[PDB]
Design a binder for this molecule. Structure first.
Ligand code: CL
Lengths: 195, 200
């Protein structure tokens, strides 16, 4: 069956700001959105929850708190502010990252108190588990949902840009639209080449 | 026409489905396929991702691999296209468990010398690859698994498919596979498998 993509495809992306691979794959999705007409929805997940390291709860608790009080629309700017500081600038002092990122995103500074409360953990677990695969397991990171189809990956070590980003998106939509596709990996295997 | 080298294990149901897919791709895209045998057991008999039939006994499982090695060494990869089609039709589509018979009938169907069946018990064939660090005939490098395909200067494991896609859909999956494999900083894309291999 010649499968056809929906009118506007959808990327649903669960993130923990601490994961470098999710950072890269989320930036790829933002690059795709510049050259393809797609919906991008960010959602919070937790490396702490995946792997149950107590500092790991701070940023996702703050992110959940911000979304609950101001809507999912603040996740994209807060994620960018946090990831720029954790990954690009390598800041491991998560107290500073949280306070700076809230200010950068234009969010109330009192949201930082969420990092040390457990009051948002129920909501965080619900959001995390909503990124579930077809049989109800957590997906390692990075993960992405393409038109409702959950994938592990694409695992990217570098951010694809521009039309190259868009071509990878077209290929992802092709794989998501074929229900009997399950895996692809790059490999370093060659035949003998005589010319 | 781009040359695609395809490394298959004769007992692997995913190699089988993806090899039927790539022959459908060659009807809607400008590629030609050269098949080559590969077994993960050559370089590491202990890994847990060997095809299921290796569980039932190594001596038995080696048979089809060694015959395919011997055939390619003596006659070139071109004869593996009919040889593999004959073996896989019996092993996978028909569930034929008697591999000695599969080998004899498949060599016959491929027009190959019947004596090549004697490679089945000769460990020279796999040990020659092993000693030079080859996971398959005419392969160097990784053996992530079977199927592995090399085309247009890049190589990939998969696509892992539970059904043989047909027509232009097969070609679209080809385009997607080559696109991902051609990005040098792409590593893996995986969806939880919800279906077993399903042959035609
Ligand atoms: Cl997840």
């Amino acid at each position: 069956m010649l499968e056809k993509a929906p009118q506007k495809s959808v990327a649903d992306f669960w993130f923990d700001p601490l994961c470098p691979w999710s950072w890269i794959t989320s930036r790829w999705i933002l690059e795709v959105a510049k050259v393809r007409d797609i919906e991008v929805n960010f959602h919070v997940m937790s490396l702490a929850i995946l792997n149950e390291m107590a500092r790991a709860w701070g940023p996702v608790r703050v992110a959940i708190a911000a979304e609950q009080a101001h809507g999912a629309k603040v996740l994209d700017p807060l994620y960018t502010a946090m990831g720029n500081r954790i990954h690009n600038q390598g800041n491991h002092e998560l107290d500073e990252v949280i306070t700076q990122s809230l200010a950068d995103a234009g969010l109330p500074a009192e949201l930082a108190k969420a990092a040390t409360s457990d009051a948002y953990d129920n909501a965080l677990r619900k959001s995390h588990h909503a990124g579930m695969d077809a049989v109800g397991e957590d997906v390692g990171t990075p993960t992405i949902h393409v038109n409702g189809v959950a994938f592990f990956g694409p695992v990217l070590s570098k951010i694809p840009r521009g039309e190259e980003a868009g071509k990878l998106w077209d290929a992802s939509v092709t794989f998501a639209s074929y229900p009997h596709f399950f895996e692809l990996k790059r490999t370093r295997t060659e035949p003998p080449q005589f010319d």
